[PDB]
Design an enzyme around this catalytic site. Sequence first.
Site, PDB file in Angstrom:
ATOM      1  N   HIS A 142      42.950  38.620  30.371  1.00 44.83           N
ATOM      2  CA  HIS A 142      42.416  39.491  31.352  1.00 44.83           C
ATOM      3  C   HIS A 142      43.193  39.529  32.544  1.00 44.83           C
ATOM      4  CE1 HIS A 142      39.412  42.222  33.381  1.00 44.83           C
ATOM      5  NE2 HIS A 142      39.890  41.302  34.580  1.00 44.83           N
ATOM      6  N   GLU A 143      43.256  38.153  33.382  1.00 43.40           N
ATOM      7  CA  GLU A 143      43.982  38.233  34.625  1.00 43.40           C
ATOM      8  C   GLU A 143      45.400  38.448  34.517  1.00 43.40           C
ATOM      9  OE1 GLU A 143      42.138  38.152  36.748  1.00 43.40           O
ATOM     10  OE2 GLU A 143      40.049  37.344  36.193  1.00 43.40           O
ATOM     11  N   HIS A 146      46.638  41.964  34.463  1.00 41.23           N
ATOM     12  CA  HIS A 146      46.641  42.447  35.807  1.00 41.23           C
ATOM     13  C   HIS A 146      48.325  42.282  36.533  1.00 41.23           C
ATOM     14  CE1 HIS A 146      42.787  43.638  36.559  1.00 41.23           C
ATOM     15  NE2 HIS A 146      42.341  42.497  36.421  1.00 41.23           N
ATOM     16  N   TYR A 157      43.754  49.440  43.087  1.00 36.45           N
ATOM     17  CA  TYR A 157      42.224  48.759  42.733  1.00 36.45           C
ATOM     18  C   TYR A 157      41.342  49.648  43.321  1.00 36.45           C
ATOM     19  CZ  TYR A 157      39.847  44.854  40.897  1.00 36.45           C
ATOM     20  OH  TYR A 157      38.947  44.025  40.294  1.00 36.45           O
ATOM     21  N   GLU A 166      40.828  47.721  35.468  1.00 39.19           N
ATOM     22  CA  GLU A 166      40.228  46.679  34.715  1.00 39.19           C
ATOM     23  C   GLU A 166      39.868  46.874  33.272  1.00 39.19           C
ATOM     24  OE1 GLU A 166      39.527  44.033  36.215  1.00 39.19           O
ATOM     25  OE2 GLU A 166      39.638  44.577  38.288  1.00 39.19           O
ATOM     26  N   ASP A 226      31.770  47.533  44.865  1.00 36.24           N
ATOM     27  CA  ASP A 226      32.638  47.056  43.824  1.00 36.24           C
ATOM     28  C   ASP A 226      34.110  47.870  43.680  1.00 36.24           C
ATOM     29  OD1 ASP A 226      33.537  45.486  41.624  1.00 36.24           O
ATOM     30  OD2 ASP A 226      33.029  47.069  40.108  1.00 36.24           O
ATOM     31  N   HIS A 231      34.682  47.537  38.178  1.00 37.91           N
ATOM     32  CA  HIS A 231      34.218  46.806  37.115  1.00 37.91           C
ATOM     33  C   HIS A 231      32.863  47.108  36.397  1.00 37.91           C
ATOM     34  CE1 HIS A 231      35.977  43.422  39.622  1.00 37.91           C
ATOM     35  NE2 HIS A 231      36.415  43.037  38.561  1.00 37.91           N
TER      36      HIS A 231
END
Length: 316
Positions: A142-143, A146, A157, A166, A226, A231
């Site tokens: 996931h990271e 990015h 974002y 995301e 958020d 998210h």
Amino acid sequence: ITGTSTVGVGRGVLGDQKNINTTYSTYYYLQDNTRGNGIFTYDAKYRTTLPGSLWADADNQFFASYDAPAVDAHYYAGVTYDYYKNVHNRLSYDGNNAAIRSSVHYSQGYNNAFWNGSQMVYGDGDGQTFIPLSGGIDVVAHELTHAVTDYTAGLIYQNESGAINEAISDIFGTLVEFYANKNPDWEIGEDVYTPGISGDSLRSMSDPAKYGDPDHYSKRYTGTQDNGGVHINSGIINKAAYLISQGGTHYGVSVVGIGRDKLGKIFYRALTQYLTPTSNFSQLRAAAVQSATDLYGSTSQEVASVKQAFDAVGVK
Ligand SMILES: [Ca+2]
Ligand SMILES: [Ca+2]
Ligand SMILES: [Ca+2]
Ligand SMILES: [Ca+2]
Ligand SMILES: [Zn+2]
């Protein structure tokens, strides 16, 4: 550091043993020379200063409790690199074999991980909400995804663009989990979330509402928290991706699944060819439809399933 490439052994966050690529130069360093310009794993030493010190070990064996988050961050970064190279013909996150850097033991009791624009960062968790987050392969992938997004579409974002950002990371995080065949599922973070509770996760792609996330555009979050629900509203896109791959009926709309591999090809092409920094959900639909058309034809089942999936989640 300059030295001799070798292979060490250690145990990850969940107690599993694995081999890792290291470099020998007086010490054995968590430096993998076999992948692009290198994978480097650092020790942040419970501080917030980055990256910290390149991880050094005296005997090339990593069985200490303190070692586990570094083993998994180092190893799962390599798996993610292999996925993008072997499946999508992409060399690292920039497409030119940029070095991949990760720091573990970030801060104290930190219940998160992130890409900071230059490297990956992993907390250890507080021991109750999370265990060290590098223990989750979908978290790591996931990271790192990015970073791919930052170098391609550049989705900003916040708001719908951030929710797409995301969702992409959740999608390819899950596809990497399937690629490694590591107890694969359509959940996010289940391996490191709440060690005292079985069967839960951070979010669900198959059924986002299970954790209070929207599964239809009419239920999207429209506030300012958020970063505008990046998210939260990602669940709308995650559900659509799940339907494209696995199929199903959602709010009365039936979708024929086309499989994970075709899902990855469609969304990777959309990400790298058609998405822009300010793309919204409606533009993502057009990008995915056009990507499926490029690959499989305007009359194909694949294009049909993409249209049905977005119809099912209310995205026109
Ligand atoms: Ca050692
Ligand atoms: Ca799993
Ligand atoms: Ca998972
Ligand atoms: Ca749990
Ligand atoms: Zn993310």
